Specification:
2 copies of one chain form a homodimer.
Chain A lengths: L3 H28 L17 H10 L15 H5 L7 H14 L9 H5 L4 H17 L17 H12 L1
Chain lengths: 164, 164
């Protein structure tokens, strides 16, 4: 009866994983290339490369692919996050400003680069998706709530990651 | 220099106040009636009455005005929040489900009734606004970011309310 409060925590993790899976698939549909596994997506968005490419996808006037830093993520795979990656996240923010996505949905650079608040970044991706679908500039993001499943392991990992 | 963090926290509060002001004005435009002062809006949405009315505004097929509990908020002004008010929030959620607003934006009833996460409800109001504007079912929410001002006291109250 109190362990159910523990299940609630499990449900919250599960739900979030579905929204990550949805964001993942949508970006892959837009970019025409694969993104990391749903379970590693958050860490995989930190260097801002995918977000910058997404930025080019709907606002090519503001986001130049050749101006993206570590566009192939070679620097990232070798060493880790580099301050310069921060500009990628900034190009994405600028792209969204250009197309008119209301400011309220924007995460801050630190929220994604320093992973201070990745969920805020995922929710923003979902709002951008809805806004883009509105303007007929991108396909509709999918609704995988109860369609997809994850292992116990994956849910636990997300659960404790979500906690502290 | 260390004082920088304080200005930041202040900015976050200021920003949020602007989005509350935007949500406030938009709902008033939709409902044709006044809502509480921007500084008291969050507390003023708790009984779910305004949200249910908003629900009727874009989904009259799902939300009948005559089925809203304490519609005139007479009970609310007299006594305080009452459990039945919870149904009002639920009607709003159902209204949004009916028009197809993606579930990811939905706060839980406890988030607004128990005020467990009011910002989550304001965020969803903005997502709903964008969506509705898209379907031509409502006017566009305005961008008041730097057009609206608040007292130091107000920004401060929101700041500490946002922290602890």
């Amino acid at each position: 009866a109190e362990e159910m409060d523990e299940r609630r925590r499990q449900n919250v993790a599960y739900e979030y994983l579905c929204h990550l899976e949805e964001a993942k698939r949508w970006m892959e549909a837009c970019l025409g290339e694969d993104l990391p596994p749903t379970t590693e997506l958050e860490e995989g968005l930190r260097n801002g490369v995918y977000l910058a490419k997404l930025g080019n996808f709907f606002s090519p006037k503001v986001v130049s692919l050749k101006k993206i830093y570590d566009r192939e993520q070679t620097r990232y795979k070798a060493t880790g996050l580099h301050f310069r990656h921060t500009d990628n996240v900034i190009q994405w923010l600028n792209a969204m400003d250009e197309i008119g996505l209301p400011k309220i949905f924007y995460p801050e650079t630190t929220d994604i680069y320093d992973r201070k608040n990745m969920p805020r970044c995922i929710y923003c991706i979902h709002a951008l998706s809805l806004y883009l679908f509105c303007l007929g500039l991108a396909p509709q993001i999918q609704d995988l709530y109860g369609k997809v499943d994850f292992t116990e392991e994956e849910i636990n990992n997300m659960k404790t990651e979500l906690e502290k």
